[PDB]
Amino acid sequence: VNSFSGYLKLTDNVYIKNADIVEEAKKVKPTVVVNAANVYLKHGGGVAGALNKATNNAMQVESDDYIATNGPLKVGGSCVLSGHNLAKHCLHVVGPNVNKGEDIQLLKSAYENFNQHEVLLAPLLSAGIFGADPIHSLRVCVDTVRTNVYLAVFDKNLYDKLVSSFL
Ligand SMILES: C[C@@](O)(C(=O)O)c1ccccc1
């Protein structure tokens, strides 16, 4: 049993809810929240700017030190950093950004990072401002992630379309 509430069960291991991932993280304090990161860990907008804003910019300060030491992530890659006031850990995952011309086949590699964690609160990778098709991102998630993933979908209209269209 875990703390996640009000999710629709899609598969054995994937759950979905219309929710603000920031507000969900604040309530649950999950072991792992996933950030929709870029390779520079520059948290300006979407999931990254909002989580970063909710940490009072401490996520960005930590991230700048990580990049200064290690250099940029790979598209499809990840790193584990602090969850600050939101979670124990934040798994920063880089899905491909269609609005930068990145290979959508890298979305499966991105979701494979989730399999290193038994339970996660996450957004749909590559969806929203990353430019991919959200129905596609949910399909790749279901077909790639084997650990227990609780997906928060910000847009009520999109949530209803994802549920209604789910195979
Ligand atoms: C915040 C967001 O990235 C999400 O994860 O739901 C998002 C996706 C799609 C439309 C609006 C917002």
mmCIF file of N, CA and C in Angstrom, residues 61-166:
data_model
loop_
_atom_site.group_PDB
_atom_site.id
_atom_site.type_symbol
_atom_site.label_atom_id
_atom_site.label_comp_id
_atom_site.label_asym_id
_atom_site.label_seq_id
_atom_site.Cartn_x
_atom_site.Cartn_y
_atom_site.Cartn_z
ATOM 1 N N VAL A 61 19.889 26.017 -7.940
ATOM 2 C CA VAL A 61 21.226 26.182 -7.320
ATOM 3 C C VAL A 61 21.948 24.829 -7.300
ATOM 4 N N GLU A 62 21.277 23.776 -6.847
ATOM 5 C CA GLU A 62 21.877 22.450 -6.805
ATOM 6 C C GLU A 62 22.221 21.972 -8.198
ATOM 7 N N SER A 63 21.331 22.235 -9.146
ATOM 8 C CA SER A 63 21.539 21.790 -10.521
ATOM 9 C C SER A 63 22.732 22.482 -11.167
ATOM 10 N N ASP A 64 22.912 23.759 -10.918
ATOM 11 C CA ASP A 64 24.052 24.490 -11.483
ATOM 12 C C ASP A 64 25.372 23.909 -10.965
ATOM 13 N N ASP A 65 25.433 23.551 -9.702
ATOM 14 C CA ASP A 65 26.634 22.901 -9.154
ATOM 15 C C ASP A 65 26.800 21.554 -9.857
ATOM 16 N N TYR A 66 25.744 20.763 -10.065
ATOM 17 C CA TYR A 66 25.856 19.440 -10.718
ATOM 18 C C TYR A 66 26.424 19.623 -12.104
ATOM 19 N N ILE A 67 25.946 20.580 -12.878
ATOM 20 C CA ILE A 67 26.430 20.774 -14.259
ATOM 21 C C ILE A 67 27.885 21.269 -14.250
ATOM 22 N N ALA A 68 28.213 22.158 -13.352
ATOM 23 C CA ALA A 68 29.591 22.682 -13.274
ATOM 24 C C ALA A 68 30.552 21.525 -13.028
ATOM 25 N N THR A 69 30.161 20.515 -12.269
ATOM 26 C CA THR A 69 31.033 19.359 -11.980
ATOM 27 C C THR A 69 30.992 18.338 -13.105
ATOM 28 N N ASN A 70 29.824 18.008 -13.637
ATOM 29 C CA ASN A 70 29.628 16.809 -14.486
ATOM 30 C C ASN A 70 29.382 17.123 -15.938
ATOM 31 N N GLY A 71 29.088 18.356 -16.320
ATOM 32 C CA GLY A 71 28.663 18.653 -17.674
ATOM 33 C C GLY A 71 27.218 18.220 -17.934
ATOM 34 N N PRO A 72 26.722 18.511 -19.100
ATOM 35 C CA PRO A 72 25.331 18.276 -19.438
ATOM 36 C C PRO A 72 24.950 16.796 -19.451
ATOM 37 N N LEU A 73 23.677 16.550 -19.191
ATOM 38 C CA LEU A 73 23.109 15.201 -19.381
ATOM 39 C C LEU A 73 23.077 14.899 -20.873
ATOM 40 N N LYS A 74 22.745 13.640 -21.181
ATOM 41 C CA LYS A 74 22.376 13.180 -22.536
ATOM 42 C C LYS A 74 20.856 13.287 -22.718
ATOM 43 N N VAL A 75 20.407 13.566 -23.921
ATOM 44 C CA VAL A 75 18.974 13.383 -24.244
ATOM 45 C C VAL A 75 18.667 11.895 -24.076
ATOM 46 N N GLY A 76 17.643 11.567 -23.280
ATOM 47 C CA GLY A 76 17.326 10.185 -22.911
ATOM 48 C C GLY A 76 17.933 9.832 -21.592
ATOM 49 N N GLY A 77 18.790 10.658 -21.006
ATOM 50 C CA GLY A 77 19.435 10.328 -19.734
ATOM 51 C C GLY A 77 18.821 10.997 -18.543
ATOM 52 N N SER A 78 19.442 10.822 -17.399
ATOM 53 C CA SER A 78 18.893 11.288 -16.131
ATOM 54 C C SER A 78 19.976 11.470 -15.087
ATOM 55 N N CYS A 79 19.646 12.163 -14.031
ATOM 56 C CA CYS A 79 20.455 12.144 -12.802
ATOM 57 C C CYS A 79 19.532 12.242 -11.627
ATOM 58 N N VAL A 80 19.982 11.734 -10.493
ATOM 59 C CA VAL A 80 19.259 11.811 -9.220
ATOM 60 C C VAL A 80 19.816 12.948 -8.396
ATOM 61 N N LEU A 81 19.001 13.889 -8.004
ATOM 62 C CA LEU A 81 19.396 14.992 -7.111
ATOM 63 C C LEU A 81 18.393 15.076 -5.968
ATOM 64 N N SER A 82 18.569 16.033 -5.096
ATOM 65 C CA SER A 82 17.632 16.211 -3.999
ATOM 66 C C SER A 82 16.216 16.493 -4.476
ATOM 67 N N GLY A 83 15.229 16.038 -3.680
ATOM 68 C CA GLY A 83 13.837 16.434 -3.883
ATOM 69 C C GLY A 83 13.448 17.692 -3.122
ATOM 70 N N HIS A 84 14.381 18.240 -2.341
ATOM 71 C CA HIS A 84 14.129 19.489 -1.591
ATOM 72 C C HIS A 84 12.883 19.303 -0.702
ATOM 73 N N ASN A 85 11.979 20.254 -0.757
ATOM 74 C CA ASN A 85 10.745 20.245 0.041
ATOM 75 C C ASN A 85 9.645 19.459 -0.638
ATOM 76 N N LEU A 86 9.889 18.873 -1.789
ATOM 77 C CA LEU A 86 8.836 18.182 -2.564
ATOM 78 C C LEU A 86 8.852 16.667 -2.437
ATOM 79 N N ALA A 87 9.992 16.056 -2.224
ATOM 80 C CA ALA A 87 10.194 14.609 -2.331
ATOM 81 C C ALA A 87 11.525 14.272 -1.675
ATOM 82 N N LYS A 88 11.789 13.015 -1.418
ATOM 83 C CA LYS A 88 13.147 12.642 -0.994
ATOM 84 C C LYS A 88 14.164 12.971 -2.090
ATOM 85 N N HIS A 89 13.886 12.488 -3.290
ATOM 86 C CA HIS A 89 14.781 12.613 -4.451
ATOM 87 C C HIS A 89 14.005 13.198 -5.612
ATOM 88 N N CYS A 90 14.718 13.913 -6.490
ATOM 89 C CA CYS A 90 14.199 14.278 -7.823
ATOM 90 C C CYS A 90 15.003 13.561 -8.873
ATOM 91 N N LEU A 91 14.340 12.770 -9.688
ATOM 92 C CA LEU A 91 14.950 12.157 -10.867
ATOM 93 C C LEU A 91 14.741 13.079 -12.044
ATOM 94 N N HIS A 92 15.801 13.776 -12.442
ATOM 95 C CA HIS A 92 15.755 14.697 -13.601
ATOM 96 C C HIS A 92 15.932 13.871 -14.865
ATOM 97 N N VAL A 93 14.907 13.766 -15.683
ATOM 98 C CA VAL A 93 14.925 12.935 -16.884
ATOM 99 C C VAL A 93 14.779 13.829 -18.092
ATOM 100 N N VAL A 94 15.632 13.621 -19.085
ATOM 101 C CA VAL A 94 15.590 14.403 -20.339
ATOM 102 C C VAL A 94 14.895 13.622 -21.430
ATOM 103 N N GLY A 95 13.638 13.949 -21.676
ATOM 104 C CA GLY A 95 13.008 13.444 -22.873
ATOM 105 C C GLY A 95 13.420 14.295 -24.076
ATOM 106 N N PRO A 96 13.286 13.744 -25.285
ATOM 107 C CA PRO A 96 13.555 14.552 -26.479
ATOM 108 C C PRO A 96 12.565 15.705 -26.588
ATOM 109 N N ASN A 97 13.112 16.861 -26.989
ATOM 110 C CA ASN A 97 12.321 18.075 -27.234
ATOM 111 C C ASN A 97 12.086 18.150 -28.744
ATOM 112 N N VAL A 98 10.863 17.908 -29.171
ATOM 113 C CA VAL A 98 10.474 18.004 -30.613
ATOM 114 C C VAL A 98 10.716 19.447 -31.086
ATOM 115 N N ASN A 99 10.468 20.450 -30.282
ATOM 116 C CA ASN A 99 10.676 21.889 -30.677
ATOM 117 C C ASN A 99 12.182 22.206 -30.821
ATOM 118 N N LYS A 100 13.103 21.251 -30.573
ATOM 119 C CA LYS A 100 14.564 21.370 -30.896
ATOM 120 C C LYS A 100 14.988 20.349 -31.959
ATOM 121 N N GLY A 101 14.087 19.540 -32.517
ATOM 122 C CA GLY A 101 14.409 18.520 -33.533
ATOM 123 C C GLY A 101 15.014 17.200 -33.042
ATOM 124 N N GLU A 102 14.828 16.815 -31.780
ATOM 125 C CA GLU A 102 15.429 15.580 -31.190
ATOM 126 C C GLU A 102 14.658 14.302 -31.566
ATOM 127 N N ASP A 103 15.328 13.171 -31.629
ATOM 128 C CA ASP A 103 14.792 11.882 -32.120
ATOM 129 C C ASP A 103 13.762 11.375 -31.101
ATOM 130 N N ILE A 104 12.506 11.233 -31.514
ATOM 131 C CA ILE A 104 11.400 10.792 -30.627
ATOM 132 C C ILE A 104 11.663 9.372 -30.146
ATOM 133 N N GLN A 105 12.475 8.551 -30.872
ATOM 134 C CA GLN A 105 12.852 7.182 -30.456
ATOM 135 C C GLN A 105 13.599 7.251 -29.138
ATOM 136 N N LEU A 106 14.114 8.469 -28.758
ATOM 137 C CA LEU A 106 14.843 8.613 -27.492
ATOM 138 C C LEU A 106 13.856 8.662 -26.336
ATOM 139 N N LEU A 107 12.542 8.761 -26.628
ATOM 140 C CA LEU A 107 11.577 8.785 -25.533
ATOM 141 C C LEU A 107 11.580 7.457 -24.743
ATOM 142 N N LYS A 108 11.749 6.341 -25.465
ATOM 143 C CA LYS A 108 11.778 5.041 -24.752
ATOM 144 C C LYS A 108 12.994 4.994 -23.807
ATOM 145 N N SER A 109 14.155 5.437 -24.305
ATOM 146 C CA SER A 109 15.374 5.493 -23.449
ATOM 147 C C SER A 109 15.141 6.353 -22.196
ATOM 148 N N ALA A 110 14.442 7.493 -22.394
ATOM 149 C CA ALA A 110 14.138 8.396 -21.280
ATOM 150 C C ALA A 110 13.326 7.655 -20.208
ATOM 151 N N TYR A 111 12.243 6.982 -20.649
ATOM 152 C CA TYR A 111 11.374 6.259 -19.696
ATOM 153 C C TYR A 111 12.103 5.085 -19.037
ATOM 154 N N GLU A 112 13.119 4.512 -19.690
ATOM 155 C CA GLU A 112 13.848 3.387 -19.064
ATOM 156 C C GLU A 112 14.497 3.820 -17.752
ATOM 157 N N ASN A 113 14.814 5.113 -17.567
ATOM 158 C CA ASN A 113 15.369 5.586 -16.301
ATOM 159 C C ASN A 113 14.427 5.306 -15.136
ATOM 160 N N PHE A 114 13.116 5.325 -15.419
ATOM 161 C CA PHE A 114 12.169 5.116 -14.305
ATOM 162 C C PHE A 114 12.308 3.712 -13.677
ATOM 163 N N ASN A 115 12.801 2.753 -14.454
ATOM 164 C CA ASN A 115 12.882 1.362 -13.976
ATOM 165 C C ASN A 115 13.923 1.215 -12.891
ATOM 166 N N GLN A 116 14.736 2.242 -12.615
ATOM 167 C CA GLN A 116 15.730 2.161 -11.528
ATOM 168 C C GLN A 116 15.095 2.540 -10.200
ATOM 169 N N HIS A 117 13.793 2.832 -10.169
ATOM 170 C CA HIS A 117 13.111 3.308 -8.962
ATOM 171 C C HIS A 117 11.796 2.550 -8.806
ATOM 172 N N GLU A 118 11.558 2.025 -7.610
ATOM 173 C CA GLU A 118 10.384 1.137 -7.415
ATOM 174 C C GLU A 118 9.059 1.893 -7.568
ATOM 175 N N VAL A 119 9.007 3.118 -7.110
ATOM 176 C CA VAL A 119 7.785 3.945 -7.174
ATOM 177 C C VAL A 119 8.164 5.375 -7.554
ATOM 178 N N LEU A 120 7.397 6.016 -8.415
ATOM 179 C CA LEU A 120 7.688 7.411 -8.826
ATOM 180 C C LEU A 120 6.408 8.172 -9.037
ATOM 181 N N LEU A 121 6.440 9.453 -8.749
ATOM 182 C CA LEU A 121 5.454 10.461 -9.203
ATOM 183 C C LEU A 121 6.063 11.130 -10.425
ATOM 184 N N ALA A 122 5.383 11.236 -11.544
ATOM 185 C CA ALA A 122 6.020 11.708 -12.794
ATOM 186 C C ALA A 122 5.036 12.432 -13.655
ATOM 187 N N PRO A 123 5.553 13.294 -14.559
ATOM 188 C CA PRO A 123 4.787 13.823 -15.683
ATOM 189 C C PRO A 123 4.985 12.940 -16.901
ATOM 190 N N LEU A 124 4.169 13.137 -17.911
ATOM 191 C CA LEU A 124 4.397 12.524 -19.202
ATOM 192 C C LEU A 124 5.611 13.128 -19.884
ATOM 193 N N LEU A 125 6.635 12.330 -20.132
ATOM 194 C CA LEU A 125 7.872 12.840 -20.744
ATOM 195 C C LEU A 125 7.604 13.325 -22.142
ATOM 196 N N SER A 126 8.360 14.304 -22.644
ATOM 197 C CA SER A 126 8.249 14.844 -24.034
ATOM 198 C C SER A 126 6.872 15.473 -24.328
ATOM 199 N N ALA A 127 5.877 15.332 -23.471
ATOM 200 C CA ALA A 127 4.597 16.022 -23.760
ATOM 201 C C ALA A 127 4.631 17.508 -23.318
ATOM 202 N N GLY A 128 3.535 18.236 -23.562
ATOM 203 C CA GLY A 128 3.456 19.662 -23.183
ATOM 204 C C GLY A 128 4.403 20.482 -24.024
ATOM 205 N N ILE A 129 5.223 21.320 -23.382
ATOM 206 C CA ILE A 129 6.151 22.219 -24.127
ATOM 207 C C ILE A 129 7.307 21.461 -24.805
ATOM 208 N N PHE A 130 7.513 20.160 -24.544
ATOM 209 C CA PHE A 130 8.566 19.354 -25.220
ATOM 210 C C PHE A 130 8.148 18.953 -26.651
ATOM 211 N N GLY A 131 6.889 19.216 -27.024
ATOM 212 C CA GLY A 131 6.394 19.114 -28.406
ATOM 213 C C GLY A 131 5.934 17.739 -28.822
ATOM 214 N N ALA A 132 5.996 16.684 -28.014
ATOM 215 C CA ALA A 132 5.559 15.367 -28.543
ATOM 216 C C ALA A 132 4.049 15.187 -28.401
ATOM 217 N N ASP A 133 3.542 14.119 -29.013
ATOM 218 C CA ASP A 133 2.109 13.745 -28.912
ATOM 219 C C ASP A 133 1.912 13.088 -27.541
ATOM 220 N N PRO A 134 1.038 13.627 -26.662
ATOM 221 C CA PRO A 134 0.845 13.050 -25.327
ATOM 222 C C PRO A 134 0.278 11.621 -25.353
ATOM 223 N N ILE A 135 -0.569 11.309 -26.332
ATOM 224 C CA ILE A 135 -1.105 9.919 -26.395
ATOM 225 C C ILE A 135 0.084 8.987 -26.601
ATOM 226 N N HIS A 136 1.040 9.434 -27.411
ATOM 227 C CA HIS A 136 2.256 8.642 -27.689
ATOM 228 C C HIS A 136 3.086 8.486 -26.414
ATOM 229 N N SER A 137 3.304 9.552 -25.702
ATOM 230 C CA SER A 137 4.132 9.494 -24.488
ATOM 231 C C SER A 137 3.530 8.496 -23.491
ATOM 232 N N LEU A 138 2.210 8.521 -23.305
ATOM 233 C CA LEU A 138 1.576 7.564 -22.386
ATOM 234 C C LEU A 138 1.744 6.130 -22.893
ATOM 235 N N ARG A 139 1.655 5.897 -24.185
ATOM 236 C CA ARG A 139 1.829 4.544 -24.723
ATOM 237 C C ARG A 139 3.261 4.075 -24.444
ATOM 238 N N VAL A 140 4.262 4.916 -24.728
ATOM 239 C CA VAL A 140 5.667 4.523 -24.476
ATOM 240 C C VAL A 140 5.835 4.266 -22.988
ATOM 241 N N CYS A 141 5.282 5.091 -22.133
ATOM 242 C CA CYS A 141 5.397 4.882 -20.684
ATOM 243 C C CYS A 141 4.894 3.483 -20.333
ATOM 244 N N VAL A 142 3.678 3.170 -20.752
ATOM 245 C CA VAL A 142 3.073 1.867 -20.394
ATOM 246 C C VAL A 142 3.907 0.728 -20.941
ATOM 247 N N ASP A 143 4.427 0.864 -22.112
ATOM 248 C CA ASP A 143 5.195 -0.210 -22.764
ATOM 249 C C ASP A 143 6.667 -0.261 -22.324
ATOM 250 N N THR A 144 7.132 0.647 -21.478
ATOM 251 C CA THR A 144 8.566 0.708 -21.103
ATOM 252 C C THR A 144 8.741 0.578 -19.618
ATOM 253 N N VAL A 145 7.961 1.292 -18.819
ATOM 254 C CA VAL A 145 8.151 1.334 -17.379
ATOM 255 C C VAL A 145 7.519 0.079 -16.794
ATOM 256 N N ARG A 146 8.266 -0.597 -15.974
ATOM 257 C CA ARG A 146 7.815 -1.807 -15.243
ATOM 258 C C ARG A 146 7.638 -1.535 -13.766
ATOM 259 N N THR A 147 8.212 -0.470 -13.219
ATOM 260 C CA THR A 147 8.018 -0.078 -11.829
ATOM 261 C C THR A 147 6.727 0.717 -11.692
ATOM 262 N N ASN A 148 6.383 1.054 -10.491
ATOM 263 C CA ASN A 148 5.050 1.662 -10.260
ATOM 264 C C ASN A 148 5.117 3.171 -10.445
ATOM 265 N N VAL A 149 4.402 3.649 -11.417
ATOM 266 C CA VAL A 149 4.457 5.070 -11.819
ATOM 267 C C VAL A 149 3.076 5.700 -11.684
ATOM 268 N N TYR A 150 3.068 6.829 -11.019
ATOM 269 C CA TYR A 150 1.872 7.649 -10.757
ATOM 270 C C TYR A 150 2.023 8.890 -11.605
ATOM 271 N N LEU A 151 1.264 9.002 -12.674
ATOM 272 C CA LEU A 151 1.387 10.098 -13.654
ATOM 273 C C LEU A 151 0.431 11.199 -13.267
ATOM 274 N N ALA A 152 0.951 12.431 -13.195
ATOM 275 C CA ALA A 152 0.147 13.645 -12.952
ATOM 276 C C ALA A 152 0.037 14.390 -14.257
ATOM 277 N N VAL A 153 -1.184 14.633 -14.673
ATOM 278 C CA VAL A 153 -1.483 15.356 -15.924
ATOM 279 C C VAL A 153 -2.146 16.668 -15.550
ATOM 280 N N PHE A 154 -1.419 17.732 -15.862
ATOM 281 C CA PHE A 154 -1.830 19.108 -15.505
ATOM 282 C C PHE A 154 -3.157 19.524 -16.146
ATOM 283 N N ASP A 155 -3.335 19.199 -17.427
ATOM 284 C CA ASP A 155 -4.491 19.696 -18.221
ATOM 285 C C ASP A 155 -5.678 18.742 -18.086
ATOM 286 N N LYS A 156 -6.782 19.244 -17.510
ATOM 287 C CA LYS A 156 -7.994 18.407 -17.326
ATOM 288 C C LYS A 156 -8.473 17.914 -18.694
ATOM 289 N N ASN A 157 -8.542 18.804 -19.682
ATOM 290 C CA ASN A 157 -8.967 18.387 -21.031
ATOM 291 C C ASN A 157 -8.077 17.267 -21.590
ATOM 292 N N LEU A 158 -6.765 17.389 -21.413
ATOM 293 C CA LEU A 158 -5.838 16.365 -21.916
ATOM 294 C C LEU A 158 -6.016 15.075 -21.108
ATOM 295 N N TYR A 159 -6.132 15.200 -19.816
ATOM 296 C CA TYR A 159 -6.361 14.005 -18.966
ATOM 297 C C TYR A 159 -7.528 13.171 -19.502
ATOM 298 N N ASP A 160 -8.652 13.860 -19.756
ATOM 299 C CA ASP A 160 -9.871 13.145 -20.225
ATOM 300 C C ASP A 160 -9.622 12.509 -21.580
ATOM 301 N N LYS A 161 -8.903 13.202 -22.466
ATOM 302 C CA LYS A 161 -8.564 12.620 -23.758
ATOM 303 C C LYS A 161 -7.614 11.423 -23.620
ATOM 304 N N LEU A 162 -6.642 11.489 -22.722
ATOM 305 C CA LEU A 162 -5.704 10.345 -22.498
ATOM 306 C C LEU A 162 -6.467 9.104 -21.985
ATOM 307 N N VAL A 163 -7.363 9.329 -21.021
ATOM 308 C CA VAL A 163 -8.146 8.186 -20.479
ATOM 309 C C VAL A 163 -9.033 7.593 -21.565
ATOM 310 N N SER A 164 -9.774 8.465 -22.257
ATOM 311 C CA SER A 164 -10.805 8.009 -23.222
ATOM 312 C C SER A 164 -10.146 7.234 -24.356
ATOM 313 N N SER A 165 -8.915 7.630 -24.743
ATOM 314 C CA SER A 165 -8.236 7.057 -25.923
ATOM 315 C C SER A 165 -7.305 5.904 -25.538
ATOM 316 N N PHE A 166 -7.214 5.564 -24.249
ATOM 317 C CA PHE A 166 -6.186 4.574 -23.792
ATOM 318 C C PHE A 166 -6.580 3.180 -24.218
#
